Design a binder for this molecule. Sequence first.
Ligand SMILES: [Ca+2]
Ligand SMILES: [Ca+2]
Ligand SMILES: [Ca+2]
Lengths: 49, 105, 263, 53, 41, 41, 41, 52, 49
Amino acid sequence: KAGSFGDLQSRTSTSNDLYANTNLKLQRPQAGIVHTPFTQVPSGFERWK
Amino acid sequence: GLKTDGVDLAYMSFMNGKTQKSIKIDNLHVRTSAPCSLVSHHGYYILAQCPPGDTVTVGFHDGPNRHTCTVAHKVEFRPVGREKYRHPPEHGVELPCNRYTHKRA
Amino acid sequence: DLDTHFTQYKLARPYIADCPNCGHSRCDSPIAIEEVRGDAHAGVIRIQTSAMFGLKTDGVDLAYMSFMNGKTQKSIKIDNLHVRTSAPCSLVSHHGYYILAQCPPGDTVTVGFHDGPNRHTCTVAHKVEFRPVGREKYRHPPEHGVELPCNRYTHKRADQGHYVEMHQPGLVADHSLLSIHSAKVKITVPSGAQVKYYCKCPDVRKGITSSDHTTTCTDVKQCRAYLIDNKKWVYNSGRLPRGEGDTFKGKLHVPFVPVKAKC
Amino acid sequence: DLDTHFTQYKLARPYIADCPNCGHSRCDSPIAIEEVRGDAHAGVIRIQTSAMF
Amino acid sequence: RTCRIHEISCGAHSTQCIPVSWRCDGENDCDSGEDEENCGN
Amino acid sequence: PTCGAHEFQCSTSSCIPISWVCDDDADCSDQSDESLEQCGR
Amino acid sequence: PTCGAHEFQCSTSSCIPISWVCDDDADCSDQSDESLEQCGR
Amino acid sequence: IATLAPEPLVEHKHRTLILHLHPDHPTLLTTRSLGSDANPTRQWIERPTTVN
Amino acid sequence: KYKTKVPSPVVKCCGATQCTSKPHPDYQCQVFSGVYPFMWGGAYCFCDT
Ligand SMILES: [Ca+2]
Ligand SMILES: [Ca+2]
Ligand SMILES: [Ca+2]
């Protein structure tokens, strides 16, 4: 649910398959500079702590 | 910006007694709670971008002297919009605000 | 040895990228804060910049740093390299792109270094907080206290199984190498630079040259110029344009990895 | 006289005692902050150290 | 048209000539978009 | 007690890797990795 | 875009006063008021 | 330049809108209805919450 | 806790570019048209708007 506990789920600590839905949305760069902005909800594991 | 002989933006002048001294700006510091980064100076006025706090103090080194003056004025941070941020972001929404001008005119 | 860690960091160069609030008007700075990590248990943080610390043109020396002003990679002795958040932090170590410091809580992260009379400051807006260990919310680590397991960033540079990738730099645009010879613009190509160009003076006149190539057009404002330096690599920032073709997946260790310690 | 306030202070010397957090790792330093006193009414404090001024 | 044998015309509207090597480069050079098509796979 | 081939053993059964010796650091409690018999300073 | 007798036009409808010309500040994106030829420096 | 909040999570129901909001700064949410009476609400959201 | 990494953007700035769908957790693509960036040492490319 992107904000509570399963924003990032991994079967093992060294596993290669990752589940991740963090509502990552890209944003338009402004005023003629090269940078990549984005907006996303914070980590629910940090919120669960 | 004046050195008692013309116009030069790297110079300042003051009085120590009845003699109007003139030096070069070596360490002109403005701090509130953290050191601010000043923008411009013209005559009696200094423009600076300061963090919030309860005191405003400026100073300049003449020789080995200090020359500090600390006034007690409460300065806050005023965000624009419907979110209360504490430092202006890298990216977001351009919104109209009201700020002091960079230019001297 | 020092060069065992510094082996793959000799193969990379600093870069100039976008920094908000560098002075007062978000210029491009030689030192640019990207990805400051602040989730340790004593207020210690690890800051990654664009400059290179502890690396000369020849050998390695822990008091010398390297940065760029244009296209010339300039080395300078570290004299006043300061990191501050709301009070001046006390830095711990530096290796390559990365600085380590122990900071009080605040909302900004500021770095800077003097070379002559220059300042070279950068200020990013990252909320860094002090996280105590245990069931008491203290505000500074005490003289005497019960030992508890805290996770911190380590003091020593080593491989430790954490990697970042470097990449071949893309085209860097320089306008100071385009000058008019008599009435026609001329390209100055220094030391195998492979300078690209793109003219639209009556039409397209694109091409790649290696020396001279006096362009037969009039104005310097109607022709762009680039620069292809592939000798040294850079970390693929989000603030740099990518290369044209395939770019190799390099490797570079992170020096101050998170470990588990006692607080 | 200025010398009257230093008659018993000439017989004393500085010393090196430990203090936490010089840099990062709790040094032994000539400056060692002992007994900070802050019970005044305008934020003026008195700091006793190991050095001699 | 009627260019040299080392160059190929583009567009066939204004009779403008380009070298052959500028094929599928990703840049819209001519007025017509025939120069970015029929490139190699 | 013997460690692996990629570990340098200072004293008291604690060993550090070969990449960690002669590098101006205290990775052992006895400072054998920066002694005069190994680095030769 | 013809401006008045007390305004200086940089390029493409951008007018600033005459006191803003050659004063070590770029008030125009054309930067014509602080150019090499207009300032004479 | 002002900040932009993270996008809320919309969950629908029978005549009910459920919003899960995870702000990073104290952020204002004001609603109204487009009928004869607007019935306005106004609150500042500091913590991750949920409103119906 | 996650860590979102951003690759370097491509600036093909006379024309247009498209992406495939790489297999990555919460992968994002976008194309922004008519940016005209400004690096150090002048603007990046000639093609306006
Ligand atoms: Ca072509
Ligand atoms: Ca060692
Ligand atoms: Ca001006």
